[PDB]
């Protein structure tokens, strides 16, 4: 039995290995991602300003794919309108919430709060990567509420944990308030990556706040939720060993944990479950609304999220989870242009969950 | 196929060979399947290293003698020299190449040369000849003159000279405005393409992924498995069966792994090797293309490279060019114009299309 | 050593083959074709009416996937301005000429005229999935000439070999005596498939009649060119093994082979080099202007041009040929939506080789 | 994982599976791993085949006799029937379900049920409640009555049911109009996954592909190989290891496969078998979606379908659903509600996609 990835083989990369597509390698060779992505030359336990600095950079170079990759499809959806809407949140910070809905549809519609990607840590929120996912999921007949929650890392200022969660929270909590005048029939909180760790952090936070009454179900997308980047070889081989098979296509073990870092620079949070939703227990997650996890097969993350849904069926929850055959971290949604088959069913399951969650309240 | 089939083939007698690619081979005598070297890569550091020099010679060699020159070069670019610091306090020099004579923003291509990161000057006539083609057909070239990790004075291994072109990447960025630059692209051949896949991993570790627009990889040499025997080679890259002996073979690729990572203890990391990068390492790359050549032994990692960048969603093209040895259309293209005009119009295209986009 | 795809093991599918991308799988699930096609209930040894009629179904069914698929990409460019041409052909028959042209651009640009795929013999000339391909490489700053040869099969009439490539030939050399007025500096000739058959036996019919001055290069691509689709799996594994590997990958061979006995119903054109461009000799190919022949990895059809990429070099034309990993026949201008990588590539190396040809007029 | 990692293993100890996905599978004692038959493929035909009528009675018995409802199953749907006639003259039931009181024009979906293509009846309550959860959704689903190669009433292997199958499909086409489709889409499960597979593979080959707006398949058993011996099913097909004996095993399944192709002679064609079907049958295919059960033996051949599908072009997405046996969510619904939630969504979903988009 030979395992796959880097299990089985540790030169492995995105051009040998016989799992990726060839329109994911053409994708990925684009900004040449088609090679196994290098470690940064700081490390995670070096200085924080340091650390920081990295971070920075990260943010600049990620932005950089976003602002600048091709995107379009043909059956791309834009009757879309979009309106903004500022609340204040828990520091009196003003939050930006930017608010899309099909133009020309009458009548209340289901409802999804989207919690964008970046680690929590990085990207901005309104950029054509985020605002074309919107869109999407607009069209296909849903009010979308994506919030501009602070991040940890911007250039005038650093905004540890738990900034975000508290202001995903207010968003949350305002959008509830608003149900009426928004014309909601459901609210769902949607999100990739770090996204998909603020949408679960946040709906555990309103449990602990007594307003879970607020969620009406939560879809985590490919979530990044173990904060353990840093953990050494021999703990992600035994834990989680997707962080071993997959690490550095795209993403990789040393450029997260420099994030994990900017997120909670004491440490003082890693076995918090509202940083890091992986060390939630069972009884912590008893009586949830329904889940969908969804977990990339070439990701180094698929390992945590999967375990976060198969601890969810032990509590009881209703959880569907599934694992995206043939994608990197992100692909759906970044890489849209090279896959449309993964792009359409990713809408039509989160437009979809959303539309369900609605009906059946 | 070729010595997957019968053990004997070589360039005279493989039926897919054209009589051209054949011809420049046998100016050197290179139509005969390559011998492996009388080193071998597990004898003493002084010995190996001795033998590289011995091969640097051989190609430098090669490079300096042979005819390139094609009636439809074009030769109106201008050149200069910049000089930055690297990681130990070494200077790098930079080539700058650009069309004469052209004012606003242009395309631009980041060069890493071959010869296994270890061998092979950077200022020499074959590959002044590859970065004045590129320019010519309107970009802005810099050729990067990182350390080899041998050098008749001196041994640097791994990481130097990934530190020093990652360097050169992140100072071009920084001068985009003043260089007149509307994209960066990396692109490299051979050991040149294991440099500009190492540099861009490098570039993600430290946060600075957005100096990189994109990634054109050459004929990549990035498994270092040359020395694997034989039943892993048939079973995991069945090209360095295939293809072994033709113009070059694993003997030789063995003692240069040795010459980069002499301890052996980077032979699965993929900064070293970007043949092991996981899945997770090659998530949100930018958009790469992977050339790989058929007769060459290096064919199938770099496919599975590409195969691998697919799955991890990235934007990846991949291409088999056929009939063609490793290095074939840069260093003999005087004998194969149609196969550089291809190369030559898919790497400038390649940046401008990265430009247009970003 | 295990050979590949469906050589190396029988029951090889897009599912199962490790080549695959999850794109390239993602693209296929769309309409179904995830799974090894089917040889249909036809042979085409049967009687011709019989075959004819799986013919006209055949047309049915390909014709409503390029009617039906998701086409669209983000980055596609749209600023082109299309006018139309009658000419007539050697029958006295109409023959359309579709142009499209960069809105704008005063001044000579290369020229390419576009034969289209369809085995000689189905799919419209004017559909959405033809002019998309047209309007691309328009865009990228060429004339594009769009015939609308006669098919072999048509509902009104059949048409077997030579009435299309006499149309295709009227076409190109109008297009040559049209050079100034169409502000053109070269003629390229391309086509895929089909089309690539028709443009290689184009080149050959002008070099017989004394006008290969008419054509200044040619860019085959995924040829369809051995007419070898029914041959014995022996003759198949020993000369063209491709046609065993990839067989059912959503092309098959018993569909081709009906098509085969459409364009020639006698079988008296089996080894004619115009009808069947892979039984040219060298002798045949010496003096062709410059060639690309581009090939698919995972397309039965793929070591038949390869051959024919081969022989053109021992015959000293400049031919340079490409295998695109990761493809099934037809992935880029097809399934382009789900492959943005490839169809970038294949639109720069087209239009690139008619500037190319162009420029060194 | 699974028996990969230990042979004992079992759904009681498998970690992976829930308890609820425990519970469901200890009503009828699947809970403990599943003993291979005592018939064999290779004995003749007669035992072969009375065993597989054993087998008809069994897993019938489980659909006849066990809980299915769930609180939020929608009941307004408007059933009717069709008769057409096959490629024998046989008389072939149509079951139509479409939502009582819409007008206008709806998504169609032609639905090919399991069972190895070899057992369970077609109008039975568990296909009922899938083809109504789906007509419920907004869709019009044709359930066809194909012939079984196993009948207690004579033998009908291949390829009886899938001509069957195809003359459905084609009558639907040409009823578009009178049925009120804005689409077709054929799905099935397991069995009736092969069935959707190997029914457009044989459209394409007569010339009839326009007929199929997009295919989903469920769960597909199409690779023929349940009685391969171990080393070659540890090597291809690691599930059929991983898996086995986790509420299907490959003895069982090997008496099917004889049935459905009792000479043996088509253990290689991928009409019978898809998974043999090559990048170049697959090629022009319509947009696929391929989904999988983590804890079924077929998982790993779907998988590698779906990559291959993909190597050809075609649109295909493709999922594995976590924690579920082989059929958990149609058969086992009653226990899994967030499971039929999601497959539902989607099949439902994949059909106005494909009828919006053609």
């Given at each position: 039995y030979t395992p796959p990835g880097r299990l089985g083989d540790?030169?492995?990369?995105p051009r040998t290995?016989?799992?990726?597509s060839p329109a994911m390698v053409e994708a990925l060779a684009t900004?040449?991602?088609?090679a196994v992505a290098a470690a940064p030359?700081?490390?995670?336990?070096?200085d924080l300003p340091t650390v920081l600095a990295a971070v920075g950079a990260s943010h600049d170079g990620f932005q950089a794919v976003y602002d600048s990759i091709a995107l379009d499809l043909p059956t791309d959806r834009d009757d879309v309108e979009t309106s903004t809407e500022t609340i204040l949140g828990v520091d009196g910070n003003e939050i930006t919430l930017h608010v899309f809905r099909p133009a020309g549809v009458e009548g209340v519609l289901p409802g999804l709060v989207y919690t964008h990607g970046?680690?929590?840590?990085?990207?901005?929120?309104?950029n054509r990567v985020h605002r074309r996912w919107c869109t999407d999921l607009a069209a296909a007949g849903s009010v979308v509420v994506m919030v501009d929650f602070r991040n940890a890392w911007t250039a005038e200022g650093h905004h540890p944990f738990p900034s975000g969660v508290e202001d995903c929270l207010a968003a949350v909590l305002w959008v509830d308030e608003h149900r009426e005048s928004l014309g909601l029939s459901g609210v769902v909180v949607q999100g990739e990556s770090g996204g998909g760790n603020l949408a679960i952090a946040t709906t555990l936070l309103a449990k602990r706040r007594g307003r879970?009454?607020?969620?009406?179900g939560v879809y985590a997308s490919i979530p990044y939720i173990?904060?353990?980047?840093?953990?050494?070889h021999e703990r992600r081989l035994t834990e989680l060993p997707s962080l071993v098979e997959?690490?550095?296509?795209?993403?990789?073990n040393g450029g997260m944990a420099l994030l994990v870092r900017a997120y909670?620079?004491?440490?003082?949070?890693?076995?918090?479950p509202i940083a890091w939703?992986?060390?939630?227990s069972e009884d912590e997650l008893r009586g949830l609304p329904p889940f969908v996890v969804a977990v990339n097969?070439?990701?180094?993350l698929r390992d945590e999220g999967i375990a976060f849904a198969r601890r969810l069926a032990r509590a009881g929850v209703d959880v569907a989870a599934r694992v995206n055959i043939?994608?990197?971290?992100?692909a759906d949604v970044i890489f849209r242009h090279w896959l449309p088959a993964a792009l359409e069913s990713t809408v039509r399951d989160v437009a979809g969950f959303a539309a369900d969650r609605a009906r059946l309240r």
């Open positions: 540790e030169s492995s990369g290995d016989p799992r990726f900004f040449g991602l088609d030359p700081v490390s995670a336990s070096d970046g680690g929590m840590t990085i990207l901005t929120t309104d879970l009454d607020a969620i009406d173990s904060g353990g980047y840093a953990w050494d997959n690490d550095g296509y795209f993403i990789e909670d620079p004491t440490g003082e949070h890693a076995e918090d939703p992986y060390f939630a097969e070439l990701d180094p043939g994608l990197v971290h992100g």
